[PDB]
Symmetry: C3
Subunit: 117 residues, 3 copies
């Protein structure tokens, strides 16, 4: 797929997702939420959406990823919403791997008002 930016790395065919990198150093105090810039824009393949999920390396530090849905039509830069849910202050260095983008298939169902049985 077409991407713009160097904040996303090539993955092995066997890997489920692509690593995403912090475009700049971020400091997070306990309880702080910040939208971390990655500098990448992309064109997701038709029929799919992207799921942003946290890396185990950073999750084990007590940092979570919030939100996380990139719709096929999104064309803006990708920012990752992160919160420090631990009781310690953390510094994310520039170009540190902060999350992963995983491509998943889309399913459209029409909604029919009825009576669930």
């Amino acid at each position: 797929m077409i991407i713009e930016g160097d904040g996303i790395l090539d993955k092995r065919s066997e890997d489920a997702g692509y690593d995403l990198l912090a475009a700049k150093e971020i400091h997070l105090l306990p309880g702080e939420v910040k939208v971390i810039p990655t500098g990448v824009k992309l064109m997701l393949p038709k029929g799919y959406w992207g799921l942003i999920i946290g890396k185990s390396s950073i999750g084990s530090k007590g940092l979570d990823v919030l939100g996380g849905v990139i719709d096929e039509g999104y064309r803006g830069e990708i920012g990752v919403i992160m919160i420090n849910v631990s009781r310690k202050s953390i510094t994310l260095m520039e170009r540190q791997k902060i999350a992963q983008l995983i491509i998943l298939p889309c399913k459209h169902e029409v909604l029919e008002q009825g009576k669930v049985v």
Copy 2:
């Protein structure tokens, strides 16, 4: 698919998920977890399950969605488990968009006790 209730909106074919709406006003203090009612019941299509995930608009306020698996067989009303992980009190207004329901395919594997190599 068959649904009952007006707490879920039609999505564009290109969107990955359907927006879910709070059935009533909810107040969340820092650290509080509450199960927010949406008023909708549904019949998921055979072969799929539903993933409830948070909206970026609310995730950026420091609210997270916990749990989040709706099995094909679930027939009860959908409630979203939300926590305020920020250091500020938040009020969710009635019929505010609080999360998204995304339909994903099911995979059944039999479990074979062996030796992973």
Copy 3:
């Protein structure tokens, strides 16, 4: 699929995921993150990855699952990264169901540097 260990249970064909069990009693104070051992190792089927997600029963207690991606190639024991984001201390008993493993398909896209339009 081949698994080793008794910390994972057989699921009904209709269920989206398999329940994962704590291999030992864990105590979590508010704000603490711990990697909970399950004792299981597995060989995921080629073409898929596994998503670890939290159970509604434990999510409603204010416990979250962080990280959560098992790549097809992972051969080590599965540990679940959990945090107590509530304001109350919690004890997870040995062999308590703490999360679910859901098998999802893999999608590989080559990355092409271009201009997103």
